[PDB]
């Protein structure tokens, strides 16, 4: 026969490898395919759908609806945060359950540009003007607007557009960050406040919800696949 | 377009000097190593030099297998005091020293990694009983998934971590991984820390180790016996072989000159004197 | 040149500074490379990088320090040593990113009666040894970045047996280069020598290096420079000897990325 | 019957190839190209009757 | 015989 | 299936084969390389660079800075040796420990011109002539300038160019010489002397140090690689 | 998508050649192919901004 | 992967199989030949070499410098054989060990012309002629001259020429013959004859001694390569 | 790259050739071919100054 | 097809 | 390619 020598490997089984192997059913009629609507071709095509952050997840408002919503009322003024949020999408509590937060899960990596949209959901009545912010990593976290306002921010009026996006740029020292907490691939912070307060007239709520949505950019992607720690079997 | 296996220059055939041209004479204040080559002291005949770097290259230099790692696991029924000996290692070449002082000769490097993977068992007590032919699970978990708790909890399923299900005495098993760095090139040394200490924050907070990056680097592979238990004991282990492959490197370092002592630079006390006695005037 | 130009004599200007010597011995580029601006397609951070060009790209002068016979040489580290210099210092701490070079210029004058030679050296990721056997990886952030006070080396290793509270900071024997590797084989690094005779000055120009395009400056040092009596002080029959050693830098293409507060480190 | 097709190559030691015949007559047994498209993400994330120009109002 | 891509 | 016949060498492992084997990681993102300064192609670069030299390993300055600092004075004329040294360069306890003498130790044949460079770090105002000697091997090692002379030198006159080097040319009866102490193979002998003196005038240090380096040429070259005896692990 | 490259030849018994099929996607699989560059060593051995002559003095 | 039957012979190892293997050490800088004189292409070529006849192996000379002697005397004619040789050329003790002899002995054939040289030794002064013959097998060996001049011979007339050659031509019934004794391939009879007698004047040795030596003809060939029994390793 | 060389055939049932092809970049682990040469004799069986003659006196 | 090095 | 001897 052809002279043959058996190299490493021979033998194994590599659960990535990518080989041909013989047919069980040969020459079996497949069923044509259909065009069913929404095909999807990459993963990060859902990443860039987006979904709802749980903010609130207090002891009492975990697992609950009421974890979706970020309580404002009409107080004075303070600069004091609304929200404060660690910019670790695969790791922190708030981020880590949105589909972006899921997909993440999968992957060893991540890199690009993130964005959060807020939506108000007080009266046609109430105005006000927020400032969402976000710090990038190596100073103290904000927790006044005074620091959170020398970041990257957007003050967001309060109007018809209902909604308001602030993107988090890709600002990295590395190439990728890793999917867990980790102080070297460490992203910053990202928090709310209010720019002036939330004015109602009479007859009016004075107490509203505002909700927010997280959603990756075209410059987004994943790598290293991996098993999540999201879904176990025990026994 | 000049290949590694090139023939090194020609000595080309020098006579006798008397000038104010002086290649002898230099000054190595500036940082600079004089370039002279035997012709420009002594006089020369003509050499049509055959020799070769080829073996000295970057690559060549790294192209072989070295252990790096030995993981020990068993085949025992697991009791509840015990139970059945699964292996758990943190990946780095740091735990041996041979390829470790190779790369170290430089700063930063690129490269392909293949690992090879020898795997070797043995009965323990004395009863004569058997085994049959064992399998292997070599399971890489990568920074964030679940690590195996038990030989056989549900990790082991790896529906996205790549697994080799390696045979008792068939080849030795291997697999190549491309460059997985999270920065352009691997760092031999970071000289740095993960954390800023914060005035603010509590020291503890701030704190952490010298030299440092990423707590979980790259992962651990988890080992396994996949046949159930046996009447008799079994031991095994897997050595693993690392060789870098299409390998680049950066920034060239001394090196290492006194025995390893950790993960760092550090060194032992008792271990710093690699020199040994010659008297100046004794050939 | 027969207009006079010399390898010895050499004027540097950044900013609104300038350097001038008579007894240079060259000036190095360190493995050839001149300082630049993060390339495009190298970028990585995507926000408009801050460049404060002749603000930061100047010289400073650190500290000066005392040779004698019994000194066994000093360290510091890039940026660390200039963290606290005028707007370079500043845009360190106000941004998460920092990339840049330097223009490192070590001065010692003498006479031509004194001898004594002090290597030089730049070493990227200076990584250096600690004062512990019963933890590796020990140095505290306070201890490994002393600023522009610098630190020492030492000619003999001695473990901190305080266990209740260890002193966490390095111990960098002298002939191992304070890293567990042999002092004569520094020379594999960009470096120049001040040999007292010959120059009264160093010049080694460095390039940013990194295994990434840019990185946090405040939580690591890309530079460290290492002095080195490699032979040692030497005047007369003066039984005491002194001459002082100024180090002047000048941080070269230096661009931010990742504005926010300012950072407030714990250096105590 | 040889399929040659590139690599992409991530660390360097012209262009890569590398080869495949399948060896089987029914398209099952053999492996993955891996040669796939991509798309936009538009029937997720626009899926409005009207286009969305995004520095105009979303609302008019 | 042989196809390119 | 096609006929083959597996031959010897089937199933084993070489540390140093050169085989493919499959990728654990499919379609991973690799990071691009970018520029980093100080690239390296061959471990010869590194050995051309000069590296200092521990010419005085007695027992009280082997292992400190001192071993680095051979010691003249304004003594009379003698015709006795600064320094003597075996051309070894990877087993000579001297120049094993060079940048150059390591690389040596990862292989077990060097052949090429190497070259020895003297740095005189007296006072500006001392003067002095000295005699650097190479003795190809096969006579009496020389103990004093008379024998010295007779082979390849150079005459070193101190003044402002500080430093001098001399070439040890090629000259082998193999073509590649062993990295071990070895009678077949060696190498000769490396020694310095006093040409005329060091003079000084008054008011001036009376003994100073010069310091060695040693470096490779264009022509040299090491083959076989090898593990090294200069690191190990115990336990 | 063969390639066919040359062999330098040692001991002796024209041009001897070997063949090499890459048989993976991944440029990672492949095995090292050795046909490696030197480059000069200047910017260790004479890292100076100005060009050393070394017949000429280094200090002037 | 590729559909491969293994076929007899798998994983043997034969001693004589040409197959390649893996580089143990790769990119070794190999050293260049030089020309050294003296190269041989073919063991046959040795073979072609006069070497000289072990001839009398009598109990007293054999082992000892006297083996290589053949006497001769002025005595008056004779028909009588000086020496008598079986054209055994791997297996009679007088020709086994010749190098003809030895390089046969590693092999189980051999085939083609010999030839026999003999030289005359005694002085200038002796004078003589000799019949040197060479019987094809089958008859009763010549003990006779009578006998030997009806085979192949040469009659040699001592002179100035030294000496004198008998090729023994390739005549055989089987295309090769067998390195051992065997009848079935025997050679046949070579022997020595006094013609007249050697004649010397007064003042002159009456005895002298010939030297014989045998070599292979252009058209000699071995083949079916094999071990001696000519060396050994007891323990 | 393959090298296609002819067989001398001894015991028949045209040229019959067989193919080889070199799987290393090593020489040293190429087969070897036995594609040899050879040479005359004369350096050890005739090493004179003098060319000889067989039909003339050896010696004149 | 082939490629020649 | 093919080389023929
Ligand atoms: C089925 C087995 C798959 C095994 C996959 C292993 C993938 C992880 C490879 C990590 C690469 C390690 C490279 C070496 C170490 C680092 O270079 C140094 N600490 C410098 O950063
Ligand atoms: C197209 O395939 C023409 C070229 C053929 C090249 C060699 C094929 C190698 C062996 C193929 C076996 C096929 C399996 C049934
Ligand atoms: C280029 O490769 C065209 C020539 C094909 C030659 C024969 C290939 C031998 C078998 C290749 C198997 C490929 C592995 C997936
Ligand atoms: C020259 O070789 C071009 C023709 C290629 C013919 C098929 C090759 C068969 C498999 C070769 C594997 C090479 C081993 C590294």
New binding site residues.
Partial sequence: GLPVMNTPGSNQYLTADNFQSPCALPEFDVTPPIDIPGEVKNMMELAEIDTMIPFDLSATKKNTMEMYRVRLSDKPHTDDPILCLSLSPASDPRLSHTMLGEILNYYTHWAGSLKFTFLFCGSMMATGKLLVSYAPPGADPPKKRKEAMLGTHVIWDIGLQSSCTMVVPWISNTTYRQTIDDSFTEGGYISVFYQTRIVVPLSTPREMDILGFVSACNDFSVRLLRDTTHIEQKA | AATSRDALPNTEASGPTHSKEIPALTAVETGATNPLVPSDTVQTRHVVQHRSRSESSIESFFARGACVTIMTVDNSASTTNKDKLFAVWKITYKDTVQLRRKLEFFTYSRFDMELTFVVTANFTETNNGHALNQVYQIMYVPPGAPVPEKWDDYTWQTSSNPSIFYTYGTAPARISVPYVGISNAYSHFYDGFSKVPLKDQSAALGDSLYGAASLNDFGILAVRVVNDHNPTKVTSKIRVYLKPKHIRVWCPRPPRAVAYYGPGVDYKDGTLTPLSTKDLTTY | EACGYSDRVLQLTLGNSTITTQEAANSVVAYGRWPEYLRDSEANPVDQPTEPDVAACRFYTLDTVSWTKESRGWWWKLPDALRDMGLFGQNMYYHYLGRSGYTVHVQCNASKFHQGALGVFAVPEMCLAGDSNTTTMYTSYQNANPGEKGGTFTGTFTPDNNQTSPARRFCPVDYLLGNGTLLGNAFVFPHQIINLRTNNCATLVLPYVNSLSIDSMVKHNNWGIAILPLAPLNFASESSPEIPITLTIAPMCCEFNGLRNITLPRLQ | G?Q?SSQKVGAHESTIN????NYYRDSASNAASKQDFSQDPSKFTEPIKDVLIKTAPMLN | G?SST
Same sequence: chains 1, 6, 8.
């Fill in positions: 040889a040659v590398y080869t495949t015949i | 042989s």
